[PDB]
Amino acid sequence: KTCDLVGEKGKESEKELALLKRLTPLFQKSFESTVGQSPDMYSYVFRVCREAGQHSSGAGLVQIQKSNGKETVVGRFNETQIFQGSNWIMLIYKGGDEYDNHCGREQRRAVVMISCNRHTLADNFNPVSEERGKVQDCFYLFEMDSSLACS
Amino acid sequence: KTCDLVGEKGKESEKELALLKRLTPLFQKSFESTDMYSYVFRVCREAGQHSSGAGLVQIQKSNGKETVVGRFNETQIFQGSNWIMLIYKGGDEYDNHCGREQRRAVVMISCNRHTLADNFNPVSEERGKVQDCFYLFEMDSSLACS
Ligand SMILES: O=P(O)(O)OC[C@H]1O[C@H](O[C@@H]2[C@@H](O[C@H]3[C@@H](O)[C@H](O)[C@@H](CO)O[C@H]3O)O[C@H](CO)[C@@H](O)[C@@H]2O)[C@@H](O)[C@@H](O)[C@@H]1O
Ligand SMILES: O=P(O)(O)OC[C@H]1O[C@H](O[C@@H]2[C@@H](O[C@H]3[C@@H](O)[C@H](O)[C@@H](CO)O[C@H]3O)O[C@H](CO)[C@@H](O)[C@@H]2O)[C@@H](O)[C@@H](O)[C@@H]1O
Ligand SMILES: *[C@@H]1O[C@H](CO)[C@@H](O)[C@H](O)[C@H]1NC(C)=O
Ligand SMILES: [Mn+2]
Ligand SMILES: [Mn+2]
């Protein structure tokens, strides 16, 4: 099980496929981070096209509430979209858990900005913000370094 | 009259309104790509010459045809550490691509101390998907620094 792109097999973007192929070396890797104070003590676990959760729900990125260890799925890698610019790669996992009292109760979303760092294959995975104040198109933002994002 | 964010007036995300304020000094400017097409980009202002309400337009050099890539009444904007991403939705619909959906503009604005705004260039056009296609552009700006 790897990331799934938009469209039945074959109608898929050769650009996005070429990118998935490029990110292969990060598949085996796992990224973690704990942000927040208390009602914010969160631990975000991120993976590229691999289960980042312990509930086998196909999570590409999970948000763990340190207090009670409850696991929330922020995005799923079978609803993945990717594209790159000159020195960055944007990764997006959709199909996350539904909001209950925010954003029209739409599924959660994770947006990961991958910037170019010649010094490491991958490192510095850091949560930036959560936009849950819109009627739609909300999301969680994270950033990380990777030499794969370089040209 | 400027950029329109998802939601009712005065009820839009405070994170986006804040961002629109920081980009005000770019409102009165106009950016152009340096092929076959010419792209003209503007922040929350008409970039075309046909009152279509275009935020970014693609011009057919040979015949002067103006194609609306995205309109500013349908903006989405957010920022990271040293970059801001602006997206204009609702361009002219595709005829033989992307489930004939409306075109779209994605502009990546990276930080740069030396300029208020410069180096606007097309990066690519993703028209090979059943949906969620888009045109991608990059530009430098000191307003993208923090
Ligand atoms: O699905 P909704 O609209 O409720 O947003 C949920 C947020 O959940 C995580 O953060 C919690 C959350 O708590 C709500 C209930 O689930 C919780 O059981 C009771 C207390 O027992 O409080 C409710 O507010 O929202 C608050 C908002 O301030 C957070 O502080 C809590 O940690 C997390 O996934 C958020 O990102 C998400 O929007
Ligand atoms: O809406 P569709 O699916 O047709 O894609 C349109 C593309 O339009 C711009 O590029 C044109 C295009 O040409 C097709 C017709 O639109 C055009 O009117 C006739 C000639 O009068 O030729 C057709 O093939 O596609 C070609 C592909 O190589 C371009 O070279 C042309 O300039 C432009 O907006 C594209 O980005 C857009 O997908
Ligand atoms: C945006 O403006 C266009 C041009 O008038 C219009 O057709 C479209 O419905 C508008 N979209 C929104 C934000 O409702
Ligand atoms: Mn909830
Ligand atoms: Mn056409």
UniProtKB/Swiss-Prot annotation, chain A:
The keyword Transport applies. Keywords: Disulfide bond, Glycoprotein, Lysosome, Membrane, Phosphoprotein, Receptor, Signal, Transmembrane, Transmembrane helix, Transport. The keyword Transport applies. Disulfide bonds join 3-49, 103-138, 116-150. This receptor has optimal binding in the presence of divalent cations. Its main location: membrane. Glycans are attached at residues 28, 54, 65, 78, 84. Transport of phosphorylated lysosomal enzymes from the Golgi complex and the cell surface to lysosomes. Lysosomal enzymes bearing phosphomannosyl residues bind specifically to mannose-6-phosphate receptors in the Golgi apparatus and the resulting receptor-ligand complex is transported to an acidic prelyosomal compartment where the low pH mediates the dissociation of the complex. It is a single-pass type I membrane protein. This is Cation-dependent mannose-6-phosphate receptor. Residues 1-151 are lumenal. One of its GO terms (cellular component) is endosome. Residues 1-151 form the MRH domain. The extracellular domain is homologous to the repeating units (of approximately 147 AA) of the cation-independent mannose 6-phosphate receptor. The gene is M6PR. GO terms for molecular function: protein domain specific binding; retromer complex binding.
